[PDB]
């Protein structure tokens, strides 16, 4: 309940500042202040052209490594378990699987950039 | 439908009860037919690779015959074991439940009525 009150108070303080920043001062707009900024010249086309982005595999493997983190994250409570040998062996195994994925990325030219 | 019999002890090709059955003889006609199948397979290898059909690679033909005979003998052992299991479960259930399967008194032809239809 207190988390909800803190969230509502933070959102109220955030959205009150922009309302103060907007409806208090005097507005005066023409069809040049609203123009897109291209260092003083007209934009060449639009910004909705598809970027030839080069780290698509790095983003996907960030996702995969985050799921590796999700597997490795409940490890502290496993420190209270009885069967310690299986715990240690398989935590080492999962960290080794992460390292194997990273090493295969390193050898097969994945951490570099396209073009 | 025999899965219950293969429920307690799984992945057994020939269980302990299969050793108490008479094994198939080497002169069984099914084993001879499977050996003929292996010989035909060897002939097909001699044919499709552009070799002489009846003389080339006698080692390949002998290997094919031996492998076919081996797997056929083991499959026939499993087959007759399963059929013996089927008949034994049959007779066990027919000893076990006589109320649901009664006896029949086979009547003679001197009193059972039949209708005769003339052909003309």
């Amino acid at each position: 309940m207190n988390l909800m009150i803190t969230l509502l108070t933070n959102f109220t303080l955030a959205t009150l500042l922009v309302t103060i920043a907007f409806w208090l001062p005097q507005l005066n707009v023409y069809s040049e202040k609203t123009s897109p900024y291209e260092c003083g010249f007209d934009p060449m086309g639009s910004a909705r052209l598809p970027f030839s982005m080069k780290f698509f595999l790095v983003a996907i493997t960030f996702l995969l490594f985050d799921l590796e983190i999700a597997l490795l994250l409940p490890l502290p409570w496993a420190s209270q378990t009885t069967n310690l040998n299986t715990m240690l062996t398989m935590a080492l195994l999962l960290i080794f699987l992460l390292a194997v994925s990273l090493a295969y990325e390193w050898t097969q030219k994945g951490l570099e950039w396209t073009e | 439908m025999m899965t219950g019999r293969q429920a307690r002890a799984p992945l057994q090709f020939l269980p302990d009860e299969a050793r108490s059955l008479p094994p198939p003889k080497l002169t069984d006609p099914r084993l001879a037919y499977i050996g003929f199948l292996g010989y035909c397979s060897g002939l097909i290898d001699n044919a499709i690779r552009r070799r002489p059909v009846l003389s080339a690679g006698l080692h390949r033909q002998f290997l094919y015959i031996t492998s076919f005979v081996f797997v056929g003998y083991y499959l026939l052992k499993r087959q007759d074991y399963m059929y013996a299991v089927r008949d034994h479960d049959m007779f066990s259930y027919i000893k076990s439940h006589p109320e649901d399967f009664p006896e029949k008194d086979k009547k003679t032809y001197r009193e059972v009525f039949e209708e005769f239809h003339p052909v003309r």
Partner: protein, 175 residues
């Protein structure tokens, strides 16, 4: 209308799901699903699942930050639609909201709807326990026995993630 907090969070869940199920654009669909995942995480926290709710939060944030990067990379049109720039998007959004309010009115009135199975109108708090689990949380030992009891599951999960890495490397090679 206080102890229906799980009901209210579920209604916001269905509202966000109807909102992003119109498929207007990947960024706005991601926004709608993220609102839905936020109130679903709120549901799981309100049912005592701190770890599971925070995990689904973090996983979804990472995954559709990647989705945001992909739709700003390749899958972009010149004029993306927000919700009203196209007709069928707004039509199916209003349609889904109307059916959502339809079974809302059906469940707050007779307290028993029949959609496939039967459903009641009381909050789920009635089924929650009256007993105390001592000095510990049970889900914590679930994810702790994940490493001790869970041998085959962790092995196949790690192997599947490694195979996912090698597959994703192999697919986008070109030659």
């Amino acid at each position: 209308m206080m102890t229906y907090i799980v009901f209210i969070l579920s209604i916001i869940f269905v509202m966000g799901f109807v909102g992003f199920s119109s498929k207007p654009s990947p960024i706005y669909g991601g926004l709608g699903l993220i609102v839905s995942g936020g109130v679903g995480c709120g549901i799981v926290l309100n049912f005592g699942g701190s770890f599971l709710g925070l995990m689904v939060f973090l996983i979804y944030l990472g995954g559709m930050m990647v989705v945001f990067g992909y739709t700003t990379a390749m899958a972009t049109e010149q004029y993306p639609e927000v919700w009203v720039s196209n007709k069928v998007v707004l039509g199916t959004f209003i349609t889904g909201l109307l059916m959502e309010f339809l079974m809302v009115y059906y469940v707050l009135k007779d307290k028993e709807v029949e959609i496939v199975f039967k459903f009641n109108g009381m909050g789920d708090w009635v089924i929650y326990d009256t007993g105390d689990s001592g000095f510990f949380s049970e889900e914590a030992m679930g994810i702790a026995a994940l490493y001790s009891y869970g041998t085959w599951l962790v092995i196949v999960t790690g192997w599947s993630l490694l195979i996912g890495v090698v597959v994703i490397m192999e697919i986008t090679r070109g030659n």
